[PDB]
Each structure stands twice: as C-alpha cells, then as structure tokens.
Design a protein around this ligand. Structure first.
Ligand SMILES: Nc1ncnc2c1ncn2[C@@H]1O[C@H](CSCC[C@H](N)C(=O)O)[C@@H](O)[C@H]1O
Ligand SMILES: Nc1ncnc2c1ncn2[C@@H]1O[C@H](CSCC[C@H](N)C(=O)O)[C@@H](O)[C@H]1O
Ligand SMILES: COc1cc(/C=C/CO)ccc1O
Ligand SMILES: COc1cc(/C=C\CO)ccc1O
Lengths: 361, 354
C-alpha cells in the first residue's frame, strides 16, 4: 500500500497500458494464424543444431511461393516473442542490419503435439474461432437485457447451434478432447477414486476421450459415455465404452459413480441442482459424483493460474446458460443441496480439481 | 513439474486472451468506468450493485454479471479491488479506478483512449484477422481479402466505421499532441502548417489554439474532411496526398508513414519536399521500433501496432530511427532531428537543409 504519486512517468505507463489493452486481440489472433500455418510444429521439427530458425527457413517449409511470407512471419513471430510464446536471438547482417531467429519457448510444449499426438493447440483454435468471437459483440446487451450473449448472436443456445454447424461442432469436440486428454492423464496418475468401481458414467463426456482413458486403466470397469445425440453421432467407438445419447436434465444413466468434468461450470445454480439431483437418483446408496472443475481463488490476484480461472468464468458468461466458476464452498453447497452427505477435494492437475460428492459420508 | 503446470496454464491463458479486450469493450460501452469515475473519490471503491443501479436495466443479474466482468479487469489491474465479507462467509468485491482508467474515461478536455479501443475491437476491424493465414500463404492484405478494397476506400463506403475510426484517431491524437505541444517548440515561428492525413483536424486545431496567428491546413481524403468540425484558423481540404499535398512552411504527418510501404513513403515524402520552401521541414510523428521483442508495455504497443499494420494496410509497418533516417535521405532531406516524444510517439524533423 505505498501510494504512487501520479507523474509524467506514471501517466506514460498508464496511457500505454490503455493502448495495449485496446489492441490486445492481436495476440491470440496472431497465435491462431501461426498454429494454422503449422509454424510451431515446423519450428519443433527443424530447429537447427543451435535451436533457432529464421523466418525464411520457416517459410521455406510452408506451401507458399509468396516472397513476402518471410517478413510477414517475422512480424508475427516478433509479437509472439514479446509475450514469451517463442524465444528469439539476434544476429548481425552484412548490412549491419540485425535479423531475428526464433526458437520454441516453454509454453510451446503444450502448443505442439506431445508423444500421445495431443496438445492445447486445438483448444486455442476453438477459443479463437470466428463463431465463438461473435458472442462478445452482445455481452453489453446481455448485462442490460438479461439472457446470454451467445443466444443473442445465434437465436439459440450453444449446444443447439453446435447441432446445426458441423464444422464448429467438430472444432469444439476436438478442443475439449485434447485438453481433457492432457488433464486426465495427469489426474489418473494421482487420483485413485475410480478403483473398485464396476460402472462409471461420464455425463457430458463429449466424444468419450475421458471414458476411454478410464477403461484403459481399469479394464474391469463398465464405462458409459453420455452426451447429446449430435456429439455421440461421431464419437469414436472406443473399446469398453458404451456411447449413449440423451439430455442429462431428463435423467442420467445408472452407475456406481458419475464423472462430470466441465459440466457444472456451464450451467446456473438452478440447472446444476437439477443435474445433481438426477445424478443422486442414478447412483447406489454408497455411490458418488466425481466433479472435475476449476475452483475460484479467494481474490482476483494477478497469477496466471487465477487468470485462467477468471478467463474461463468470462467465457462461461459469454457462452453458457448461467454457467460460471465457483468456489470450494459453492461446490460444497451444491452437493448439500442435491442431497449428498459428504464432500471432499481429492486431487488437482492443471488447475482442475477433482471433488467427490458422496451419497453417504 | 510445476514447470509443466505453469506452461499448460500459460497456454490456456493465451487461448482465451480475447476475453480481456472484449470484456473491457463491454464495460466501456456500458459507461461503467465513467460511472465509477463520477460515483466515488479517486481512491474509493464501489459495488457492482451500485454501478448497475445507474444503468437503465431491470435485469436482476446485472450486478453479478458486472462483478464477473470487473473481476476479469481487476485481475489485470485495469480496475482496483477490495474484498468485503458477507454474512454467509462468501466474499464480494468492490471496485475502483486504477491509473489506466484515467486514459479510458474523459479527461479535462473531454477525450480518452476509449474511442480508440472501440475502434480496435469493432467487428469490422476484427474480421481481417481471419485472413492472416491466407495472406501469408497467398500474398496480399488480410483487410482486402475480407472486404475487397483497401481500408481507406472501405471507410469511404461505410459511414459508421468512418466515424468510429476518425474519432478513435482524433481522441488518441488529442492526448498525445497535448503532451508534445508542452515540450516541442518546432511549430513556433511558422506562418503556415499543413497536417497531411490530419483526419478530422484535432491536431491542426490544437496547433492554432497554441499559436493563434498560424494558418493551418488540415488535409485528408474527402470522406474524412466532410466530418471535420470547423475550427477558427483551420482550413479543411480534401485530396489524395499521393497526387500532391498543400504548400506550407512545414508539413506534419502523424501515423501516416506507418500505414505505407517504403516505396509509398518515398512518393509521399517527395511530394512533401516539393511543397515546402527551401528551408522547410516535415515533422514526422511515429512510434520507433525497439531493437528487440522485449516484454515492456511500451514495446508491446509498438509491436501490436506493427501487427495491426500487417492486417490492415498495404505495406504499412513500424520502423526504427535508422529506417526513418533512410526514408528522409532517400526523399532528399539533408538533416534529421529527433525533437520530442510523448506516449511512444517520437517527433522527428526531416530538414531540407542542415
Ligand atoms: N443436456 C445435456 N445432456 C448431456 N450432455 C450435455 C447437455 N448439454 C451439454 N452437454 C455436453 O456437455 C459437454 C460440456 S463441455 C465438457 C466435455 C467434457 N466433459 C470435457 O471436459 O472435455 C459437451 O460435450 C456438451 O455436448
Ligand atoms: N491518399 C491519402 N491522402 C490523404 N490522406 C490519406 C490518404 N490515405 C489515407 N489518408 C488518411 O491518413 C490518416 C491515417 S490515420 C492518422 C490520422 C491523424 N494524423 C492522427 O494521427 O490522428 C487517415 O485520416 C486517412 O484518411
Ligand atoms: C489503418 O491505419 C491505422 C490503423 C490503426 C489501428 C486500427 C485498429 O486499432 C492505427 C493507426 C493507423 O494509421
Ligand atoms: C460451452 O462450454 C464450454 C466452452 C468453453 C469455451 C471455449 C474454450 O476454447 C470451454 C469449456 C466449456 O465447458
């Protein structure tokens, strides 16, 4: 709490932060272009001995003959580098002009395929898709009028819309599947709560990536992946997973445990309660709901981990019917209100906490 | 691996990074920051509910929805916060103005950067970004791919975005030029100044306000000039600067060179050279590209603007001081002076004689 006295110097920084904010979208939009160009994968596969590659040497590997591609790439990569998305090194030219060569930064491990063929890049392409930008033009309308920005832009809710637009359905389902594969692989290394179950139901389990992973690790479990019919239609037929289409607000398939990852955050308290009562009803006396969600931090602190949660809260506001992020006590109160007697935070990976709503304490 | 954890979380932050400007846009469109600025003292805080009470809404969710937008802003220090415990043991937030809000609400003169943000985040200016991959593989300009014409021809056809653009520029330039005019003496003693590409004339008007005996000419395309307010001592004139520019003792160009290729800059600069007396000058007001992709806010503004020029302009880019020198030399100027800087904008003089 030392007080900063306003000066020329502090005004310069305040004015420039306002300008940075004004044009902040250039970052995710330039990163989206780089990933669609396969630039980061090119960098990963052809980084010379040194580990730094020129924009011309990148552009050489693209399907282009545009002679401006190298300078255009340099300009994109310079932006990325300023934000530590790639690294750089400088080398002096014959002219005494200085050129930049670029390398992978640490974050690139999650923006290029790992050994399992997976990354967050498909998640980025989801979040920056033209479809999911459009609701942001209706956010002020939703605050004033009530309702949901997405539904103002499209005339229907997000799921119904994905049911009409095959391109974005596939982008969405793949963004979620890849992200969830990375998180769940880490969850499964640490969390033991699937052990001993004979049946699990992944409610809102998407194309079934998670369900497949749980059965791969526990071949004695019966796994049901449950989602909307337009998602189930082109879920891979993973062995040991039964895909079932339906609407979870109507009810859910019976199992020993029900897994819900990134389901509660999509829905209002009232919708969650209805879903969680349906879950309680589909479980045996001793069963549980396994809830995988972020947890809101105590304050809007500046950490990246906090910002991810808060960013996601803002995504939920733009996209979903009452969806929001919640604190640990908020999740506990949803558990209690839907009849569950026990609550615990069992595990965490990449911000995603694994909570158990226990029918019996 | 907290190391893997932090790289994964950074990736997710990047992925949804558009939430920040778009959330800020909505708070500005709602008049939230202005509400805050008028409703509590500079060091005070205000609840979402008290802000929402000043909006014309009966939406019972307005307060929480504002809370969630303001929390996003708070996490980035765009607004300040303080916590207040509720009887339930939940905590709620009250919010206040951070220093940046001084440039996102109207100042003494009635301007801020808010209209510049509304420009940059308008759906029209966002759409070219979906054609960046295409421009890189195929050649050409993302904007022209989206709209089928250069940006300036497009603004002569879309009256709404013309106004948005001109106002964004006018309000940004008013802030910058007020600060430059405190420090820079190079307009002193001139009989006539011409602001080439002067938009709706904010900078010319400020010059004449400071130096009331100067004769100022504000020169731009005719769809811009038609919207320029009248200002005593400013003559508004339409035309194409590539065909020629008005004569005067000095020519001022702010954010002109950065819109164009080096070749086009030479053409412009030679037109300016020809329009000046023998010992005249061009006063160039532009950012200067820093020598590396450093993480400073100041450098990021420049590099983001280099990226904007990539998306929008035929050949436009940001330049180093030595690049500007090379432009001055190649258009016949014999002296070069870095005279002043305000809010990243350097004021360079290209002198016909040294
Ligand atoms: N009424 C409903 N019934 C069942 N599933 C639904 C639903 N409404 C939305 N969903 C599904 O809920 C999911 C939310 S996204 C999360 C998907 C997945 N659990 C993961 O973490 O990767 C989507 O697959 C969506 O189709
Ligand atoms: N051929 C041409 N002749 C004159 N002006 C032009 C032009 N092409 C573009 N412009 C103008 O160049 C300006 C670039 S934006 C900068 C505006 C102003 N100098 C400021 O800094 O606020 C616009 O107003 C645009 O209309
Ligand atoms: C098209 O030319 C310009 C564009 C911008 C920024 C537009 C969106 O932020 C800023 C200055 C210019 O000279
Ligand atoms: C519509 O529901 C969801 C949306 C997103 C949105 C964008 C992430 O790229 C994230 C998680 C969800 O459960």
């Amino acid at each position: 709490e030392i007080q900063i006295i306003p000066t020329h110097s502090s005004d310069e920084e305040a004015n420039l932060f306002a300008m940075q904010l004004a044009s902040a979208a250039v970052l995710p939009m330039a990163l989206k272009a780089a990933i669609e160009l396969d630039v980061l994968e090119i960098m990963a596969k052809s980084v010379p001995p040194s580990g730094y590659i020129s924009p011309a040497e990148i552009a050489a590997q693209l399907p282009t003959t545009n002679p401006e591609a190298p300078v255009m790439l340099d300009r994109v990569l310079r932006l990325l580098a300023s934000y530590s998305v790639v690294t750089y090194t400088l080398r002096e030219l014959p002219s005494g002009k200085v050129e930049r060569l670029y390398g992978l930064a640490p974050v690139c491990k999650f923006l290029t395929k790992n050994e399992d063929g997976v990354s967050l890049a498909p998640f980025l392409l989801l979040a920056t898709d033209k479809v999911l930008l459009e609701p942001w033009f209706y956010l002020k309308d939703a605050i004033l009028e009530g309702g949901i920005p997405f539904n103002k832009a499209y005339g229907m809710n997000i799921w119904d819309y994905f049911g009409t637009d095959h391109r974005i359905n596939k982008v969405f389902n793949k963004g979620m599947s890849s992200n969830s594969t990375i998180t769940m692989k880490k969850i499964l290394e640490m969390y033991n709560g699937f052990e001993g179950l004979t049946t699990i139901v992944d409610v809102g389990g998407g194309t079934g990536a998670v369900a497949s992973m749980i059965v791969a690790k526990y071949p004695s479990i019966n796994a049901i992946n449950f989602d909307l019919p337009h998602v189930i239609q082109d879920a891979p037929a993973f062995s040991g997973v039964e895909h079932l289409g339906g609407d979870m607000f109507d009810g859910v398939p019976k199992g020993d445990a029900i897994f819900i990852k990134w389901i509660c955050h999509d829905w209002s308290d009232e919708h969650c309660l209805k879903l969680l009562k349906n879950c309680y009803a589909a479980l045996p006396d001793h069963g549980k709901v396994i809830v995988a969600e972020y947890i809101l931090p105590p304050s809007p602190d500046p950490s990246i981990a906090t910002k991810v949660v808060i960013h996601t809260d803002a995504l939920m506001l733009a996209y979903n019917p009452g969806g929001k992020e919640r604190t640990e006590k908020e999740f506990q109160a949803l558990a209690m209100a839907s009849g569950f007697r026990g609550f615990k935070v069992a595990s965490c990976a990449f911000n995603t906490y694994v909570m158990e709503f226990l029918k019996t304490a």
